[PDB]
Every structure is written in structure tokens, then in C-alpha cells.
Symmetry: C2
Subunit: 539 residues, 2 copies
């Protein structure tokens, strides 16, 4: 990607422990934007603005989180560009990002659980539900309503749940049990789950209304396919025909044929009969991604490699044929966890790019101290041979990523005044008699002051206001510029308050006027230089 | 082109801008290798939340944000020594020191008498004894690099913008954006003289020495420069500085040798100037190669102008000569630019980096918030060539490029490190030896819990607290291999922290939440590292 040329895909990377989501240019691998979710963001005021606190809700007091599995919504198994879903492994939260504006717009705490592993989206007919694994010793599969951001129901299971995926028919979800020689993949029949809901075969644990179903062994709702051993990843192939459970402690992967699952649910066949391959690949197989020619790419954590293999040949070998299913092994640097192909989790898998997330970079970059970056490696798989083309230092241990063709995402260039994200601020303003598109007013409410001001580069609509020492001050800034990329900032000097105000947005922030005398506020973002003003704090 | 297996030639220290951090970049890759938290609350490392970082932030530990402005590395003597990086928080009147051995912020001060801080540079020669910055009361601040305390302040007329230093240790310089305006020149020798002679005032409840550098004073000389000048940049031969015209289409070149005679009264302030070349609309900032050329950002024109300094001197004295060598479009609205080792005697003329404020069409769209564009230009050959377009987050104001040989960080922490010394001292008063103990100490409604970690285990499986107890967790990573960072994460309490090999970190929270509460090693250290805090009603 020379200068002047554009990337072909957007990458949505997990921020890991940074609590953000990152947008990347694929194949350049350059970071284009950071979207704050679970962190406190100095740049935007996310965590500190009243709008962001409202979105955070009950968890607004949390300052950190571990951004885990980012997935984008689909319509019938292709990305639709609408939302990106992400979980906080550390605090039992799932967040939704709206891709028109690239900001987090909803966040929920999942009830009845102390941790959240694994998040994926329903593929087909479209993303109605988001699924993830919870724990409290025992496990709960969670089905969340994507558009409502509410928990629909949960299914209690035998075992401890790890990763999840979904099929390409809308009938089934599945998850790996990391603990119960064999472990299992639990398969969830959605039809049967929804039936059981209408019948009223459910419980609520104390202090909530989330309906909990019984999906333990011998339930109608679930079948347990045995698989070795403490498996990790579970990955659906882009033809809808198989899924792969990744051995981890065992040097294999088990391939299951989704068409057989009905027969397992009827008792027409036994759970083991779902499995149609068990190819030995190498030590520590964690995660499998797929191309468009029926090959798979599996990360070998202990071996530090990617194994390319062919799924039809593996099925043939499990039936005693002499065919080589392993195509190639490629060293990676070092300790690969997850890997993802370009549009890989969808029907549009194009077989161009494989990304590998390696946990230890070692000698691969300049030394920068005891805290070291991870390595994200870009692999050209478009040809017969896999080829390592780029090493991407990466911060705070991203767990997972997602790659979408640019044609499927179309962000806004400006906010719109009716956006739900600052609707409640607009509501508050209306209560005070204030029209945000034209007014610069100060409202006095007891020991509170709300200060409504507009900004048009190169100045604020209010030169100054006067408050008392001690007063709780709320500042509502509306950026009335109508030109793309003309972000304004509001910074109240020496109070540790700053926030971006994008074109057409309103933002607000609340602080105590603790310091007496003339305080300066200004436009911190390049919006000029006059954008300046004074808060006179009186003794 | 840095291929897989090849390493970058230089480290870049990039301003975090409004992110409040410093970024470490590989040059010429332009890959972000690390983020050093400074003025921000960092979720990944716990910086801003841990007791160690709160101690370093001091009187500003309540602030949750800032705008990290000018990163500059220490020198000996006109050459980077890799020891420290200094950086200011424009928004909150703070300066911070990063130790490059550990790549962490080790000191932070709030500067007195000042309501905001703009420029920051390091003394070059004989070594980085002082760090200099500009404050609005305006005040010139001289900070003791090593001690991180303000040595003295100098009151001037007009409003200070950017600053630089000479290559002899005699003179500091600053632009005034408000009162032709001026560049104030400060004589260090005469400033130190006046300190010793007691010719200084104090303010308020600080005892910071404040000297008079207003017009007419012995300490300062005001050189007139058009118009609301921005950048002030010292050429790498030490002979000139350039003040950047901004509103005026020019740069002014002052000859540093002439400044003694300006201070003596032998020549006039205006006689300092030896070239005023016209370059283009909006000249903001200049960088230098190692062949006599300068590279100036033209903001309104959106270009870089390469010109020659000696030819501009010749043209100023009537000669019929062409000083302007090339103009280059950049994309778009160039603010600052820096050359590889450019602000030192080691300037190598390999690479120019340009910070442009508007991406517009250069990257995939990503919403109403757009990245800025950091453009890498190859300046080795005759003409300048654009080789790379670097999206950057949150408006980086400034950067510096240092050769990798001059930086040499630690692989591990050491137990005596002053960054956890007071924790170590607190553990000692509790009778605790951090390299071996897993203990719980009870004190009123305080609880101190000391634990060790060796992958894949915490030394303490579980402990018991009452509801509402104030709990400090001190974790010591005892692995001895590089790159085996651990984390401590107490689930559902919004507490996480990195614990690098041999380091100690502590975090204090209230146990608000009854019942079993899991903590674990969030960072890949795995997978057993788990443990239970039992909170009892």
C-alpha cells in the first residue's frame, strides 16, 4: 500500500488489556483509529463525559477492562457493517459499537456470571443474537438480543465453557468445554431452546428476570459430542458444512459435520458419529481459520507454527485412505494463539490474507524495556505457498481480530442532531429552555451550574462565565461546524478535563470548580488559536 | 522497507497528543512498538491506578487526563545519551520524566505560578543539566533535569510559544506569539549570576526564584521577528537558529556568534539576523540535514520547502542566488517536522518525518473522528521523496528520532528500583520480605495482602476480607526471564495491573461485593493462575 493508495479491508482488533478496539488497514497493518470501550480515554473524554457514563450505566465507576472478542453483525452469513460486539473478560460486560459513528453505544453487564469467555454472533438468517460463555465452578451459555442489547436467556450446562461458534443455518450454536480421555463440545438447538421458553420450562436466580434453561447432560436442549482434550477453539467452515474443535493438549483437531447434528438430536445416531475427521497436526493446536478452497490454517502453540491442511483429505485419512492431508507448516514468531483470514468467518472468505496473533515477539523488534510487544504476522495465502510478509508489533495482548472488506462498512462523516447517544443531554437542555444549535447560556441550579455553549472554529460562543468555589459545573459544548474532520476539543486547564466534540455532536462534562481565580478553557484540537475563554471562580 | 527479521534503524518518541501518553516508534517502519503511559489512566498497565504511579503523579494523582506535548531526550554534549525523555502536559501545567532503562515515567511535577505550559526542550551542551519550558503566568522555566524540580523562572514581556537551546551552553531562545514580534534570548551565565546575587522575587506559597527578564533587563535580549512567530529551531552545526514566520511568509535566521555582541551593546538586536528568506504561506517549523539545508513546513500551502542556509544569507545581502531547492506536497496541513537525529550533532540527513493535521482522503474512512497523517520522507537523494503515510491517533504535536545504538533498555527490573521503593519500605514495616512471603496483614479496616507470582501460579490461592474493607494487593513477579509479564486482575472490580519480571506492583480497592471474587493472571504468563477473595458480611 504505497502512499495515495487505500487499504482493501478493515481489521477490528481486540485491544486486550487496553480496553479499546482498534481499527486497522489490511494489508498495510497500520492502526487507523482506537475506539474506547472499557477504558478511560484521555483523547475523547470517554469515561469522563456524561454521555459515555450513561452508556456504561452500572459499570460507569470501573476504569479498566479486558477487551476480548470483537465480532461484526451479519445478514445471512456476510458482514453487514452495522455493529461490532465485544466482551470484557475481566468484568462480565458486553458492549456494542455502532459502525456508522465508530463509538460504543450500548454496554451491559451480563447477570448471574462472574466472567465472560468467548463471544460470537449469529450468522444466519442474520445477527439476531450474540452468544457468549459465562461462569459462576459451573457454566451458562448466554444468548443476548443483538439489537435490544438485553440478555434473552441462558442455558446452564455440565462442564466449563470456553469458545463458541454458530452455524450457517440458524439452527445451532456450539461451545467447547475446557473441563468436564475426552471432553466435549456442547451443541445447542435454538428451536428447542425457544420452544422451552414458550412452554415456561425455566428458572430465575435471585435478583433478576433472566430466564435460565436446563441444558445439562440428558436435557432435550443440548447434545455433548466427546472430543479430546480440554479443546480450545471452535471454528465454523465458511461452507456451513463443518466445524473444527481444536485439541490443545491433544495434537489433533476434530471436525464435525453439521448436517449430522439433527440425527444426533433425534437419537438416530450417537454423539461420536457427528465427528468425520480427527487429523494429527502438531503440538498445541489452538485455533483454525479457513480459506475459500477447502483448506484450514491451524495455530500450533507449542510447535510455534501454522499448519495448512485440507479438510476433505483429512476425512479421507480418518477412513483409512493413504492421502496426505497436511500441506505445509510455517514458522511463526512466536507462540501463535488466534489466526484469522480475510472475511474468514463469513461466506465471503476470499483466501487472500491470514493474520496470526503471536504472544511473544522476542528478537523480532527493537528492544523497548521489560514490557514488550506481541507480534501480529501477516501471511499471504493467496497462492499455493503460505508466505510471511509483515510483523506487526502490537500492544497489550490482543486476543482476537476480525477482517471485513471495505465495501461492507460505510461510516458517517458527521453526527446528526437526533443521535440517541446525546439525546438525554438534548432532553436536559430542553428542560432548561435551551436550544443547543443557537444558545450560549449559564443556568444556575442550587450549587450546580450548567453552561451551554456552541463552538464554531475559530471560537467558542462564550468568552467567560463566573461560578463560586465549590460549584459542580456541567459544560455542554455543541460543535456546529459542517465540515468533515473539524473536531473541536474542550479543555478546562488544570482540572484534568478534556473532551472531543466532533462536527454536529454535543458533549458534556461535569467537574467541581476547586481552584479559585481565573481558569482558562480552550479548544485543544486543531479547529486559528483564538478558541479560548475564562471561568472566573469566586471566593 | 523493514522486512520480517530485519530491525528498525531508529527509535521515534512521539507525543501522544490528547491520549496523554508517549509512543515509541520504529523508524523507518513507522510501527508503534510501545506506549508509555504518562498523563493518562492506562487500563493495560494499571498506570494511574496503582499505588506506584499515584506516588509518581504526586499532587496531580487526581487528574485522569492530559495532553502530552513535546518529548525530548537528554543529551551529552549535543548528542543523545539515551538516559531520559522529558515531556509536558500542555493542559495541566506538568512535566514528566521517562526513564529509558525501564521505559516508564519515573517523575512528574506541577510547575508553580503557571497556568499553562507550551514548549519544552532540553539543554544540549555541555549536557542536559536543565530542561526548559514556557509558561503563561509569561514565565520561562528552568528545570533541574536530574532532580526534577524547578531551578528558577524568568519573567518576560509578551507571550512565550516555543524554545530551543544553543550548542555552547550559554543561551536559550524563545518566540513570542504576542508582544514584528520578538525572540527572547536568555543568558544562562547572567541568570545564574543574578540568582547568587539574590536579585529575585518569590510568589504565593512557593519559594521558586523568579527573575526579571522584561525589556531593559540585563538577563534577556529581544530580537524583532515577524509575525507572531512559531517554531524556533537550532541548526545542528550550532551556528544558526531559525524562527518560523507563520503569519509572515518568511523565516528569520539569527547567527548565534553575534549574540555576545548583542548582550554587550556592541551591536543592536536586529543585527543578530543574517537571512530572512521568503518561502511560502504559513511557515511553522524547520528541521535540518547535514549538508546546510533546511526543511520548512508551510501550513497554508501544505508543503515542505527545502532551502539552503548559506544561499539565503547570500540572497539577504543582495546576491543573485537561488536558496529554494524544492517544494513537496504533503497531505495535508503540515505542523511539525523532524529529521533523523536532527536536533543533535549526529543529524544524518536520512529521513524527514512530517506531522500533517488532516488525513482527508489518504486513509479508509473511520467515522467522524479521523486520524492525522505522519509522512515519512526519504531525504538521502538529491530531491525529497514521499515513501510512507502513517495514520496517527489524537493529534501528535511533536516527535524526536534517535539512533538505536544510543538507547539500551533493561530486559528486567531490579529489586532496588526506586519506582517501588516505598512499597518495599511498607512491606518491611509489616515484617514482610517480598521475594518470599505470601501473607495477609490486617490493620483496622485496612488489609494488606502480599503475594508472589511465578508462572503459572500465584503464591496465595485465597484470602478472607470483611465487606467494605480497604484492600491493598502487592504482587511481586518472581520470574527471571524477559517478556514474562504477569497481570493481576480482580474480576468485577475494574482493577488490573501489569507486573513485569522482578517488579512489584500494588493496587488498593474497596471490597464492595460479597461472596467469592476471582482474581487471576490476565496477561499470558498459563492457565492455572486463579484465586479467590472471600468477602464476608
Amino acid at each position: 500500500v504505497h502512499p495515495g493508495e487505500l487499504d482493501e479491508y478493515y481489521g477490528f482488533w481486540s485491544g486486550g488489556h487496553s480496553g479499546e478496539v482498534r481499527i486497522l488497514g489490511i494489508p498495510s497493518m497500520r492502526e487507523l483509529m482506537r475506539i474506547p470501550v472499557f477504558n478511560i480515554d484521555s483523547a475523547t473524554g470517554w469515561g469522563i463525559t456524561n454521555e459515555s457514563k450513561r452508556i456504561k450505566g452500572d459499570s460507569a465507576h470501573l476504569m479498566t477492562g479486558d477487551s476480548h472478542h470483537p465480532h461484526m453483525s451479519m445478514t445471512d452469513g456476510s458482514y453487514n457493517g452495522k455493529y461490532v460486539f465485544i466482551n470484557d473478560k475481566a468484568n462480565s460486560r458486553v458492549a456494542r459499537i455502532r459502525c456508522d459513528v465508530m463509538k460504543t453505544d450500548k454496554m451491559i453487564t451480563i447477570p448471574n456470571v462472574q466472567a465472560i469467555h468467548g463471544l460470537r454472533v449469529q450468522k444466519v438468517p442474520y445477527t439476531k443474537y450474540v452468544i457468549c460463555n459465562g461462569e459462576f465452578y459451573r457454566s451458562l451459555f448466554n444468548v443476548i438480543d443483538a439489537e435490544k442489547m438485553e440478555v434473552a436467556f441462558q442455558v446452564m450446562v455440565d462442564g466449563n465453557l470456553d469458545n463458541t461458534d454458530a452455524d450457517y443455518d440458524g439452527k445451532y450454536f456450539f461451545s467447547t468445554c475446557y473441563n468436564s480421555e475426552r471432553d466435549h463440545v456442547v451443541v445447542f438447538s435454538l428451536e428447542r431452546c425457544l420452544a422451552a421458553l414458550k412452554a415456561g420450562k425455566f428458572t430465575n436466580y435471585n435478583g433478576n428476570k433472566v430466564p435460565v434453561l436446563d441444558g445439562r447432560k440428558g436435557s432435550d436442549l443440548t447434545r455433548y459430542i466427546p472430543v479430546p482434550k480440554s479443546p480450545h477453539g471452535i471454528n465454523t467452515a465458511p461452507d456451513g458444512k463443518y466445524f473444527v474443535a481444536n485439541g490443545k493438549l491433544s495434537p489433533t483437531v476434530s471436525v464435525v459435520e453439521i448436517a449430522r447434528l439433527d440425527d444426533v438430536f433425534s437419537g438416530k445416531i450417537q454423539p461420536r458419529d457427528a465427528i468425520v475427521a480427527e487429523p494429527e497436526l502438531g503440538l498445541g493446536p489452538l485455533h483454525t481459520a479457513f480459506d475459500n478452497k477447502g483448506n484450514a490454517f491451524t495455530t500450533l502453540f507449542l510447535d510455534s507454527q501454522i499448519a495448512k491442511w485440507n479438510i476433505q483429505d483429512a476425512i479421507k485419512a480418518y477412513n483409512g485412505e493413504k492421502v496426505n492431508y497436511l500441506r505445509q507448516k510455517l514458522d511463526v514468531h512466536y507462540q501463535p494463539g488466534h489466526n484469522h483470514t480475510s472475511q474468514g468467518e463469513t461466506r465471503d472468505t476470499d483466501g487472500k490474507w491470514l493474520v496470526v496473533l503471536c504472544k511473544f515477539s522476542k528478537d523480532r523488534f527493537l528492544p523497548v524495556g521489560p514490557l514488550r510487544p506481541e507480534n501480529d504476522q501477516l501471511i499471504d495465502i493467496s497462492g499455493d505457498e503460505m508466505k510471511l510478509v509483515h510483523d506487526g508489533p502490537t500492544f497489550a495482548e490482543p486476543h482476537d481480530c476480525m477482517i471485513v472488506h471495505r465495501s461492507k462498512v460505510k461510516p458517517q462523516k458527521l453526527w446528526t442532531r437526533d443521535d440517541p447517544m446525546f439525546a438525554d443531554t438534548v432532553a436536559m437542555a430542553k428542560q432548561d429552555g435551551v436550544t443547543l444549535e443557537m444558545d450560549n447560556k449559564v443556568i444556575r441550579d442550587g450549587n450546580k451550574v450548567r453552561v451551554y455553549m456552541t463552538s464554531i472554529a475559530p471560537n467558542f460562543g462564550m468568552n467567560e462565565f463566573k461560578v463560586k468555589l465549590g460549584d459542580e459545573v456541567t459544560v455542554v459544548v455543541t460543535n456546529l461546524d459542517q465540515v468533515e474532520d473539524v473536531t473541536h476539543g474542550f479543555c478546562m486547564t488544570n482540572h484534568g478535563v478534556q473532551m472531543e466534540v466532533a462536527p454536529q455532536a454535543t458533549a458534556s462534562v461535569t467537574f467541581i470548580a476547586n481552584k479559585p481565580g481565573v481558569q482558562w478553557y480552550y479548544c485543544n484540537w486543531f479547529c486559528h488559536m483564538e478558541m479560548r475563554g475564562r471561568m472566573l471562580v469566586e471566593a
